């Protein structure tokens, strides 16, 4: 499937607006969403893989896309690490799979949140890319209470094509990111 709000909203609203602020010669010079990497860090699931495969289907479900099992490298003896036993699911969203995700995130996930007041404005990594963390994971749509075994949220990395911060900063604002300012 390839057709919905954020896609259009970006092309038939965000796309031109941006051009009014910075005025790009060429079409591609325009900032552009194109990558969203969700990633939990359940080092706790190191032992019991029960929680492992479960959060894996929770994750793959909220995103619709298949989940990848991240592996370890060095060794945090200070918390039971060696080669690659541990895990931390990671899915990478692009094209429409991404859009459809951002649809729920902006209209459902972000909305119902234990005291929401805005996203951190400083969270821009100095290059057209934003990062945010979620505590609860049931704040996503199809996650009923009788389904959650425990609070195991994650963090999302959103990638753009913009160089400067405030340049991409606007890009997410126009899309629907409620920055705390």
């Amino acid at each position: 499937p390839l057709d919905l709000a954020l896609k259009r909203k970006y092309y038939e609203e965000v796309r031109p607006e941006l051009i009014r602020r910075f005025g790009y010669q060429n079409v591609w010079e325009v900032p552009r969403l194109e990558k969203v990497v969700i990633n939990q860090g359940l080092g706790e699931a190191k032992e019991d893989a029960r929680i492992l495969e479960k959060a894996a289907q929770e994750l793959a479900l909220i995103t619709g896309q298949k989940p990848a099992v991240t592996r370890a490298k060095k060794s945090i003896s200070n918390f039971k690490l060696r080669k690659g036993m541990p895990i931390g699911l990671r899915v990478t969203l692009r094209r429409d799979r991404m859009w459809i995700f951002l649809e729920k995130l902006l209209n459902v996930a972000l909305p119902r949140i234990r005291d929401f007041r805005g996203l951190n404005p400083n969270s821009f990594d100095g290059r057209g890319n934003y990062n945010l963390g979620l505590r609860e994971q049931l704040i996503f749509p199809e996650i009923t209470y009788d389904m959650v075994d425990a609070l195991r949220g994650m963090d999302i990395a959103v990638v753009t094509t913009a160089e400067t911060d405030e340049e991409a900063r606007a890009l997410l604002e126009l899309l629907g990111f409620p920055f705390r300012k």
């Binding site: 919905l4 459809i100 209209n107 459902v108 972000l110 909305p111 119902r112 749509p141 199809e142």
Partner: peptide, 30 residues
């Protein structure tokens, strides 16, 4: 796959996701 995001606060969003069963108590409009 369609989806009925019937927000409790009047709003009734609609997008794409597995199973059309959705009933957000309060979404982006409250």
């Amino acid at each position: 796959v369609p989806a009925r995001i019937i927000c409790g606060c009047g709003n009734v969003i609609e997008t794409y996701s597995t199973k059309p069963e959705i009933y957000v108590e309060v979404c982006s409009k409250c």
